[PDB]
Design a protein around this motif. Structure first.
Motif: not given
Ligand code: CLA
Ligand code: CLA
Ligand code: CLA
Ligand code: CLA
Ligand code: CLA
Ligand SMILES: CC(C)=CCC/C(C)=C\CC/C(C)=C/CC/C(C)=C/CC/C(C)=C/CC/C(C)=C/CC/C(C)=C/CC/C(C)=C/CC/C(C)=C/CC1=CC(=O)C(C)=C(C)C1=O
Ligand SMILES: CCCCCCCCCCCCCCCCCC(=O)OC[C@H](CO[C@@H]1O[C@H](CO)[C@H](O)[C@H](O)[C@H]1O)OC(=O)CCCCCCCCCCCCCCCCC
Ligand SMILES: CCCCCCCCCCCCCCCC(=O)OC[C@H](CO[C@@H]1O[C@H](CS(=O)(=O)O)[C@@H](O)[C@H](O)[C@H]1O)OC(=O)CCCCCCCCCCCCCCC
Ligand SMILES: CCCCCCCCCCCCCCCC(=O)OC[C@H](COP(=O)(O)OC[C@@H](O)CO)OC(=O)CCCCCCCCCCCCCCC
Ligand SMILES: CCCCCCCCCCCCCCCC(=O)OC[C@H](COP(=O)(O)OC[C@@H](O)CO)OC(=O)CCCCCCCCCCCCCCC
Ligand SMILES: CCCCCCCCCCCCCCCC(=O)OC[C@H](COP(=O)(O)OC[C@@H](O)CO)OC(=O)CCCCCCCCCCCCCCC
Ligand SMILES: [Fe+2]
Lengths: 48, 38, 30, 93, 245, 170, 42, 56, 48, 193, 42, 30
Positions: B6-15, B18-19, B22, B25
């Motif tokens: 029940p601890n499973k969550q979704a992961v997000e990385l919006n645009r 990301l920019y 990127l 790095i």
């Protein structure tokens, strides 16, 4: 004598030797004392 | 296997993130390359 | 040969800046 | 040795080195193979071909077959990689 | 030994007895005749040491380091014969025939393998005295032939009396006026003969069997690989046996 | 044997992908042939199981669930899709013939995988470094010298016996 | 002459953390497309 | 003074080198330089970049 | 238990090899058992 | 024919013409994974050494049989104008009869940088016979690119590699996309009726 | 001595096509999680 | 140094085989 382990960039090798591992399966020690059979706790057997 | 976790969550990385990552790095690669190449 | 790496990193950084400006997530109300 | 001079006197020049040739080099001289060729090959270094008559265990018949081909025998410096391979150099027809 | 001759071939094979020397029983004396001849001289090494710079406690002295044999039980010389020449004062031995060489490979600490031809070829060995005694000492120089013959091909097909004389896998190295001169020492296979020194020492003599036997110590150089590597000094010790007639 | 001696065609990674596709295709032929034949359904009373099949039947003649269960416990991994199974029986030998055709186009131009140069350079300057790689080059130099006068007779190759590479005693 | 391991340190130090973030962004948009319910959810 | 990546610089050491001291505060456009190689030798690109950057 | 057992058995060489000790100038060093120093010199960090 | 010597005739040969007559410029002498320029193989060419002319003791000209492009290695063999073997470099040296030490082969160079120069000792004649089977002999610089010593292929050989392998792979794409065109109504499967 | 560009050819030839497939698999599972509708969709 | 790459590729291949067997997608009916 003139090429010890700290001249060769060895990082985990001094920590094995600090607590007692001197011999390897290849027959050498870092003290220069040639060894017949180190058994399990050589440098290679500790790594494995 | 026990039950479904029940601890499973979704992961997000919006645009935007990301920019930003990127850019981070690539700029760290631009900065540190001259030192690594020496 | 390392100038190939230096050029690729700088041109690759400018391509990220291009996509960050013209392919940005548009801020939207409601 | 890359460039070994006196390479003709081993087997091919029809003048045979006494110190370095294999026992098959004396097959070109009738009467020498095998018992006279065996005595040249099995014994030590020779300064000239005249030292072949000082081989212990020769006859007058084995000497007269040597004097037939003393035109064809010669003594060079014994190269040790050819001296050890004088009985059997690993060549078989 | 009389014990070994009591056995069959089937009783000895596999056991490792055939690589051992006979032990001699007793302290006696044998005075060699003018036609005397050692006949079945066995020479068994029991210790091997290769000279190498070692780092003991704080310095770098040269030490003969004990090494382990990896060519299993093929190292013992046997059936060595040759006449025993009686000089004015001393007794000498000139070996002629027999299995007077054994290729042995020892391994140094570090994994370094040292092949060497353990030999007594062309041994002229001078003694002290005129009879074989339990304190008699015989010793002399011998000739060590090269470990590989000129017929030996290397991994690239080059040898001394046969083979290629060029690194044939690199054909563009034969170009310009210099050619393959940087690869000369590997392309030029040289048969080298070095010297060794053995010091035997009789301590047991059986007069009824006309058998002597004692210890030895020998030093020689190792394989040069047709002049491509620098040879190492190999010190060996062990037991010998001989019969005197 | 011409293309081993002159081109080192076994060393070519495109022939190696071809061998994997052909031996993998013969493996897939034998496994799928024997798995179907040993997961058959009892559809008759005869011990001869070939009679218990109709070419127009709609039922599967063998148990895919049992066949998947068998190979999942024997091999760890099993096919679950009959469509993916039979496409894979197509894919493996055809890829093997296509990858080996690519490397033989390279041998047409003598763009061969002949030498590992770092092993050739090491064995040149160190005459005890022997691998099974360098042993195969001596076999190729034997092939190229002993067959070339007879296999290329237009070229009038006259090799004397002194230049033919031999080992000792052979 | 430069250090040859730096080509690996720069290019894997660029590409592997960049492709990790490209991975995270793409699965964020794919999760939004699956929840949206039309023609991209499947 | 080398300043570019193809003449052996890295990102840190690389630069667009300023104009020649022999030029001084003189205006050095491309058309006052008799060849582009003379313009590149005397630090011409610095004056072009700086004057277009400060206007821009 | 692991801190005590490492000190009592491994380092003192009761049931262990000891640790690396050396002279004051790093010439001759070896692994050996080390007796514990219970006084104030046990807080000298160069005292093994 | 126009009253020049052998040395003057061979000095008129351009080095660009002699460079084409050398097996390291053959595009069928490279390898699939021998990467880089042809200079990475043998070095950067610097000077033509000249044309060697091999003669034995009686005086007729011997020529080294050139290496064919099939052969990575090739035996060094000297033939006369009739193709008869007169000298070689023997693998086995024992019963050798056509070795260069027996026949007494000398080499004269003509043109190039060794233009008037005679070599009569068999060690250096054997060194020049090994390089004469690769065609015209050039002095190379194998330290600028740190050349390894194995021939690479030319851009002519590389073009033919890529475009004949691309054309083969594109033949499959013709069969796939052509079969996908004609059979478009059944590429989700066929009907059972 | 081996060719130094082969370290780049092997390691980028491994990692970049492998991380492309890891990217494709992860967005496939994230799209299924978004369409499933519970606790992982958001 | 290239034996580090050779070892990593072989050990990395065996790790894929481990995950393909024990972390496989289980075939499920209905
Ligand atoms: C870290 C905790 C600790 C422990 C477990 C010990 C234990 C010991 N000390 Mg040591 N000592 C310590 C810290 C410690 N000391 C510190 C910080 C110093 C200042 C550097 C000293 C200086 C010292 C000297 C000079 C001597 C000892 C001696 C001793 C031994 C005899 C016990 C005694 O009471 O004699 C009393 C004798 C004294 C001279 C008084 C010093 C003892 C100190 C005050 C120990 C008290 C620390 C205590 C146990 C910590 C518990 C605190 C608690 C509130 C948690 C005993 C093994 C004696 C020994 O046997 O040497 C071989 C000894 O001569 N100690
Ligand atoms: C483990 C052993 C092994 C295996 C499995 C393979 C596998 C292969 N080898 Mg390799 N090989 C090996 C070891 C092996 N090799 C060794 C040790 C050597 C020495 C180095 C070689 C040397 C070698 C060479 C030189 C070649 C191969 C080729 C091949 C490929 C064969 C392609 C083929 O099917 O041709 C069969 C032929 C066809 C598929 C053509 C079509 C045939 C038509 C359809 C026949 C129609 C006939 C018709 C019905 C008329 C018949 C009736 C008539 C008689 C009246 C295949 C990948 C070939 C290759 O790579 O090709 C790309 C190739 O040229 N191998
Ligand atoms: C935004 C447009 C713009 C501007 C303002 C500049 C400006 C400049 N360029 Mg750049 N340039 C540009 C775009 C521009 N550039 C573009 C698009 C290109 C690619 C084609 C270039 C390619 C280029 C090159 C290759 C070079 C320049 C150079 C220059 C410098 C001198 C050029 C010059 O002498 O012009 C002539 C200017 C005038 C005639 C001035 C006009 C202004 C009027 C007269 C206003 C005055 C009002 C007056 C005082 C009112 C009095 C009224 C009263 C009496 C009643 C100047 C800083 C040079 C340089 O950088 O030198 C180091 C140079 O070499 N440019
Ligand atoms: C608490 C911390 C600690 C640490 C870090 C060490 C560390 C060490 N001890 Mg010491 N020692 C300690 C406390 C400690 N000790 C204690 C509490 C005791 C009393 C029991 C000892 C008594 C002792 C003795 C008598 C000896 C050592 C030795 C060693 C050295 C080698 C052992 C080893 O590395 O195994 C590392 C173990 C692992 C990384 C776990 C392995 C787990 C796998 C699953 C099992 C492996 C299977 C099998 C054991 C090995 C397979 C063989 C194959 C690899 C060839 C190492 C420096 C030996 C030595 O110095 O020899 C030169 C030695 O003889 N110790
Ligand atoms: C038609 C395509 C083509 C052709 C014929 C050439 C031809 C050439 N290139 Mg060029 N090049 C090309 C496209 C091409 N290039 C492309 C698309 C790029 C950008 C990537 C380059 C970038 C490039 C550079 C940086 C250099 C060259 C160089 C060269 C020259 C030497 C060739 C060589 O040594 O290869 C070596 C041999 C190979 C690369 C083998 C090819 C690959 C084999 C067939 C395996 C196939 C891939 C394999 C299945 C996947 C790997 C598995 C993975 C999991 C690890 C030669 C003239 C060199 C040169 O001399 O320049 C002055 C040079 O330095 N090229
Ligand atoms: C670890 C150490 C030290 C390693 C060193 C080892 C070393 C020396 C090398 C190893 C490296 C190695 C792998 C090299 C090989 C490289 C090589 C040649 C690669 C080829 C690559 C390639 C792209 C080739 C092209 C051709 C190609 C596509 C071939 C693939 C072949 C292939 C994978 C075939 C399948 C093999 C396979 C085992 C299938 C079994 C199928 C099976 C489980 C059936 C089960 C099954 C059957 C049924 O019928 C039914 C009904 C059901 C239900 C069912 O389930
Ligand atoms: C209680 C706490 C005690 C401390 C925890 C136990 C000790 C663990 C500390 C780490 C292990 C010690 C280092 C490894 C030693 C070593 O090399 O081993 C092997 C050594 C001897 O090893 C020999 O060494 C020789 C010299 O090098 C040669 O190399 C020989 O080949 C090698 O075999 O033997 C021991 O020290 C083994 C003891 C390790 C402890 C055994 C397990 C005890 C745990 C039981 C407690 C559980 C009770 C719970 C109740 C339920
Ligand atoms: C518990 C038994 C421990 C056996 C041991 O002593 O190993 C000693 C030997 C090496 O001996 C060593 O081998 C040395 C030879 S060499 O250096 O390896 O070449 C030798 O010098 C040395 O005396 C000897 O100890 O080690 C191995 O052979 C063990 C192989 C590792 C087993 C893998 C387990 C797989 C896990 C899944
Ligand atoms: C072997 C394995 C190795 C693993 C390494 C790989 C992981 C490393 C990558 C992670 C870093 C990601 C950072 C993402 C970046 C990112 O996600 O930012 C956005 C994020 C804010 O996120 P929010 O809370 O808005 O959440 C949005 C979410 O979608 C984010 O997941 O900010 C931060 O993470 C903290 C601030 C970092 C700010 C970043 C700015 C960096 C400054 C740039 C400097 C460059 C310009 C300088 C010029 C002078
Ligand atoms: C020489 C030419 C090569 C062999 C030529 C003859 C073909 C074999 C025909 C009979 C096969 C027998 C028969 O037809 O068996 C078919 C068998 C299932 O058939 P049934 O069970 O109906 O019949 C087998 C018996 O039970 C008879 O009732 O299929 C299998 O599962 C085979 C899978 C194993 C895969 C390996 C099989 C290879 C075995 C064949 C080699 C044996 C030769 C023995 C001859 C009897
Ligand atoms: C000792 C007893 C235990 C056995 C040891 C376990 C070894 C098992 C090997 C599994 C590899 C899995 C392949 C992943 C792929 C995977 O997991 O596929 C799983 C796959 C399941 O397919 P489904 O029918 O579920 O797929 C339907 C759709 O999902 C199609 O995408 O099964 C097959 O397609 C593969 C069967 C052939 C399996 C071929 C194995 C290849 C042999 C290994 C080659 C590499 C050796 C390299 C050595 C360096
Ligand atoms: Fe089927």
């Amino acid at each position: 004598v003139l090429n010890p382990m700290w001249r060769q960039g060895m990082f985990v090798m001094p920590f094995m030797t600090r607590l007692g591992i001197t011999d390897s399966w290849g027959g050498w020690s870092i003290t220069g004392e040639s060894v017949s059979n180190p058994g399990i706790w050589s440098f290679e057997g500790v790594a494995l | 296997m026990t039950g479904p976790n029940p601890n499973k969550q979704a992961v997000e990385l919006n645009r935007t993130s990301l920019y930003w990552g990127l850019l981070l790095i690539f700029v760290l690669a631009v900065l540190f390359s001259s030192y690594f190449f020496n | 040969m390392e100038a190939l790496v230096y050029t690729f990193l700088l041109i690759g950084t400018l391509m990220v800046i291009f996509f960050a400006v013209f392919f940005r997530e548009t801020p939207r109300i409601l | 040795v890359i460039d070994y001079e006196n390479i003709g006197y081993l087997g091919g020049s029809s003048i045979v080195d006494i110190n370095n040739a294999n026992v098959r080099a004396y097959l070109k001289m009738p009467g020498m193979y095998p018992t006279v060729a065996g005595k040249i090959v099995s014994h030590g270094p020779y300064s000239g071909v005249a030292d072949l008559y000082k081989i212990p265990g020769l006859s007058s018949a084995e000497a007269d077959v040597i004097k037939k081909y003393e035109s064809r025998l010669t003594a060079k410096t014994p190269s040790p990689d050819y001296v050890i391979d004088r009985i059997n150099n690993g060549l078989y027809r | 030994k009389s014990q070994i001759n009591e056995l069959s071939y089937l009783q000895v094979k596999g056991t490792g007895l055939a690589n051992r020397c006979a032990e001699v029983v007793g302290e006696d004396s044998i005075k060699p005749k003018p036609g005397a001849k050692l006949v079945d001289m066995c020479i068994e090494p029991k210790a091997w040491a290769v000279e190498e710079e070692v780092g003991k406690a704080g310095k770098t002295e040269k030490k003969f380091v004990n090494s382990k044999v990896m060519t299993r039980q093929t190292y013992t010389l046997d059936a060595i014969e040759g006449p025993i020449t009686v000089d004015g004062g001393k007794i000498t031995f000139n070996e002629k025939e027999g299995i007077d060489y054994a290729a042995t490979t020892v391994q140094l600490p570090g994994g370094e393998r040292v092949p060497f031809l353990f030999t007594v070829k062309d041994l002229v060995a001078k003694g002290n005295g005129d009879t074989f005694k339990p304190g008699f000492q015989m010793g002399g120089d011998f000739n060590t032939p090269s470990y590989r013959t000129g017929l030996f091909l290397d991994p690239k097909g080059r040898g001394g009396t046969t083979g290629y004389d060029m690194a044939v896998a690199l054909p563009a190295l034969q170009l310009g006026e210099e050619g393959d001169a940087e690869l000369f020492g590997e392309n030029n296979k040289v048969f080298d003969i070095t010297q060794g020194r053995i010091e035997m020492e009789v301590n047991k003599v059986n007069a009824e069997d006309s058998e002597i036997g004692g210890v030895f110590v020998a030093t020689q150089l190792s394989d040069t690989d047709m002049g491509s590597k620098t040879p190492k000094k190999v010190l060996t010790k062990g037991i010998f046996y001989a019969k005197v007639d | 044997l011409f293309l081993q001696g002159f081109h080192n065609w076994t060393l070519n990674p495109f022939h190696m992908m071809g061998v994997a596709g052909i031996l993998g295709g013969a493996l897939l032929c034998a496994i799928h042939g024997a798995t179907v034949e040993n997961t058959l359904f009892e559809d008759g009373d005869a011990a001869n199981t070939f009679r218990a099949f109709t070419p127009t039947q709609s039922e599967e003649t063998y148990s895919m669930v049992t066949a998947n269960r068998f190979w999942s416990q024997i091999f760890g991994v099993a096919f679950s899709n009959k469509r993916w199974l039979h496409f894979f029986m197509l894919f493996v030998p055809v890829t093997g013939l296509w990858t080996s055709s690519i490397g033989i186009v390279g041998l047409a131009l003598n763009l061969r995988a002949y030498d590992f140069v770092s092993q050739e350079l090491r064995a040149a300057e160190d005459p005890e470094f022997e691998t099974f790689y360098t042993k195969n080059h001596l076999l190729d130099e034997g092939i190229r010298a002993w067959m070339a006068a007879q296999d290329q007779p237009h070229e009038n190759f006259v090799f004397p016996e002194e230049v033919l590479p031999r080992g000792n005693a052979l | 002459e430069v250090q040859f391991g730096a080509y690996l340190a720069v290019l894997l130090g660029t590409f592997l953390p960049a492709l990790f973030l490209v991975n995270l962004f793409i699965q964020t948009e794919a999760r939004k497309a699956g929840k949206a319910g039309g023609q991209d959810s499947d | 003074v080398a300043g570019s990546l193809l003449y052996g610089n890295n990102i840190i050491s690389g630069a667009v080198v300023p104009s020649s001291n022999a030029i001084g505060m003189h205006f050095y456009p491309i058309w006052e330089a008799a060849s582009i190689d003379e313009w590149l030798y005397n630090g011409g690109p610095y004056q072009l970049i700086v004057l277009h950057f400060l206007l821009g | 238990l692991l801190c005590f057992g490492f000190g009592a058995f491994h380092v003192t060489g009761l049931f262990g090899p000891g640790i690396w000790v050396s002279d004051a100038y790093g010439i001759t060093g070896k692994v050996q058992p080390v007796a514990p120093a219970w006084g104030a010199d046990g807080f000298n960090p160069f005292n093994p | 024919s126009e009253g020049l010597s052998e040395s003057q005739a061979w000095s008129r040969i351009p080095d660009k013409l002699a460079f084409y007559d050398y097996i390291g410029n053959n595009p069928a002498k490279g390898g699939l994974f021998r990467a880089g320029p042809m200079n990475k193989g043998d070095g950067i060419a610097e000077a033509w050494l000249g044309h060697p002319i091999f003669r034995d003791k009686e005086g007729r000209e011997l020529t080294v049989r050139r290496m064919p492009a099939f052969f990575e290695t090739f035996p060094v063999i000297l033939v006369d104008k009739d193709g008869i073997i007169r000298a070689d470099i023997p693998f086995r040296r024992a019963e050798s009869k056509y070795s260069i030490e027996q026949v007494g082969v000398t080499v004269d160079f003509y043109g190039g940088k060794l233009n008037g120069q005679t070599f009569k000792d068999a060690p250096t004649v054997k060194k020049f016979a090994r390089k004469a089977q690769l065609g015209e002999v050039f002095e190379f610089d194998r330290t600028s690119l740190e050349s390894d010593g194995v021939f690479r292929s030319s851009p002519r050989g590389w073009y033919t590699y890529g475009h004949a392998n691309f054309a083969l792979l594109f033949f499959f794409g013709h069969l796939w996309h052509g079969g996908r065109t004609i059979f478009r109504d059944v590429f989700t499967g066929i009907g059972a009726e």
